[PDB]
């Protein structure tokens, strides 16, 4: 349930997409699968992503709803059903302000819970109303969503267990999400005025809030943050009573919200209603939501040359997404020299990650991979046999 209280009016640090092309399942020729392009870490949000088969754009392409990470950068998954063959080559083609030319990436065949809402408003000068996209998660599972460009102009279901909600639910969420929208639209105007930015340019406001319950299902922690142009603007502190503002502009907002009791209102929502509806959702979707899938792990070894090789430690089909992969070398931790890819969605509700290091020939046995995940009875330590 979206908040019905606590929401009140108040460069672009550009960042390049990271791009992963992979299959949902281990690829076997002639067996149906999904091809995924996960693009993450980018700002701003205007991005063009196409999937190519033998150089040609695949026409039937779906994508996830726009969401973003703790540093405010965005991520999207593009995916399509496909059946691999020996001859056909697949790729993903991406374009973004931060890229001088479209990047083609080739396919290479070889305890606690939270409810969170993400909100993005993108001004499109000369192109109409600002784009607004709202998504709701329980842990790492999207269940609702609003997109101002879609046909319904309603809050929409994205999980089977929310589909059973009543019409009072969908009307009410549509009301409150549209209230968030209009708040953000006023903020885009006001904020742009204050910084004397030109009316021609596109800007982003982002908002994220939510609540954690522990294993007793009682309130554990709450959060609420606000960014302008991918930069921290104002954030509720962990005590949910006071504000941190970086900009000078954000200090006028801080006084406004202190005088209007915004943090008290948010606290009432985050400690009560948020937790109650989190509990309802956890129960209604318990078979899907209250599971953990331990990571299925293995190590690969690719010879760079005669004097070194890449050891890649894989964790596949896990849930929830939180995971730690560490490499040590003779018990010394190798974080600085470890290639670490973003955790990425398989497309079926599980997640994927790997971590590689480059090892001189014949010293593989000195390197240990370490895997930590809630679905693991004890942390795993991998080593290469020979």
């Amino acid at each position: 349930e979206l908040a019905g209280i606590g929401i009140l009016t108040v460069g672009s640090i550009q960042r390049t997409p990271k791009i992963q092309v992979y299959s949902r399942h281990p690829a076997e020729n002639g067996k149906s699968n999904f091809l995924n392009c996960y693009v993450s870490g980018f700002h701003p949000s205007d991005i063009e992503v196409d999937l190519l088969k033998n150089g040609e754009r695949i026409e039937k392409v779906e994508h996830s709803d726009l969401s973003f990470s703790k540093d405010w950068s965005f991520y999207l998954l593009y995916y399509t059903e496909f059946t691999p063959t020996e001859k056909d080559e697949y790729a993903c083609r991406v374009n973004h302000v931060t890229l001088s030319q479209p990047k083609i990436v080739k396919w290479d065949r070889d305890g606690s819970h939270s409810m969170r809402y993400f909100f993005t408003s993108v001004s499109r000068p000369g192109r109409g109303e600002p784009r607004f996209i709202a998504v709701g998660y329980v842990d790492d599972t999207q269940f609702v969503r609003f997109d101002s460009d879609a046909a319904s102009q309603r809050m929409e279901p994205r999980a089977p267990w929310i589909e059973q909600e009543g019409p009072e639910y969908w009307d009410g969420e549509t009301r409150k999400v549209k209230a968030h929208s209009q708040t953000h639209r006023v903020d885009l105007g006001t904020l742009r005025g204050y910084y004397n930015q030109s009316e021609a340019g596109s800007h982003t406001v982002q908002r994220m809030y939510g609540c954690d319950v522990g294993s007793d299902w009682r309130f554990l922690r709450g959060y609420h943050q606000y960014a302008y142009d991918g930069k921290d603007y104002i954030a509720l502190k962990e005590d949910l009573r006071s504000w941190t503002a970086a900009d000078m502009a954000a200090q006028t907002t801080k006084h406004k919200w202190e005088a209007a009791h915004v943090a008290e209102q948010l606290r009432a929502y985050l400690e009560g209603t948020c937790v109650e509806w989190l509990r309802r959702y956890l129960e209604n979707g318990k078979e899907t939501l209250q599971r953990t899938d331990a990571p299925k792990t293995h190590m690969t070894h690719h010879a760079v040359s005669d004097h070194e090789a890449t050891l890649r430690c894989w964790a596949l089909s896990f849930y929830p997404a939180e995971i730690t992969l560490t490499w040590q070398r003779d018990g010394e931790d190798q974080t600085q020299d470890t290639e670490l890819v973003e955790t990425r969605p398989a497309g079926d509700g599980t997640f994927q990650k790997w971590a590689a290091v480059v090892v001189p020939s014949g010293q593989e046995q000195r390197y240990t991979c370490h895997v930590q995940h809630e679905g693991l009875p004890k942390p795993l330590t991998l080593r290469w046999e020979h």
Binding site: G4, R175, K178, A179, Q182
Partner: protein, 198 residues
Amino acid sequence: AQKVTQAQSSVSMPVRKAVTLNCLYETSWWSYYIFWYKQLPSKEMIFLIRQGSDEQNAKSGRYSVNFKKAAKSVALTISALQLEDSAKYFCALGELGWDTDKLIFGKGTRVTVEPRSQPHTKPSVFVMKNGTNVACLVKEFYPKDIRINLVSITEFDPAIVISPSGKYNAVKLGKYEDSNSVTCSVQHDNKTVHSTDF
């Protein structure tokens, strides 16, 4: 910035017919809600119907809303009027839809439900007494328009009420020094009925 105006102060319509109550509002917000409430003489404020800015015209039983977002007109129509529909009707404008939101009301418009249109019935006229107070009682008349004159200290406005037969009864009281001989005459439907006639 936000305002609600109900131009009509009172409205009268007969039973079984329909009445329309206009309302004009002013809001800067893109999506909002309009509500129509009913206020009883016992003071209950009863919710009747809600209309969204981006929704189609609302219909809920005997209530309907003719919404015109361009003109910002949200008129409520009450069909098949019942006598118990007599109340003060308020148009209220929501804001964004937060639990902290107030409603901006208009002043109300009183609706009085009249008995059905029927053939005209000439009344009987009586005088009632207690010392100096003399009351003229007018029984079973239609239409409502009547002028009751006691021909002669003080005089009060007459009371006209709906009769159990669907017509009207009326009582006018006053105090007169020559009370013992004062009798009453009433002008109704172009005819004059004197208490002396009976």
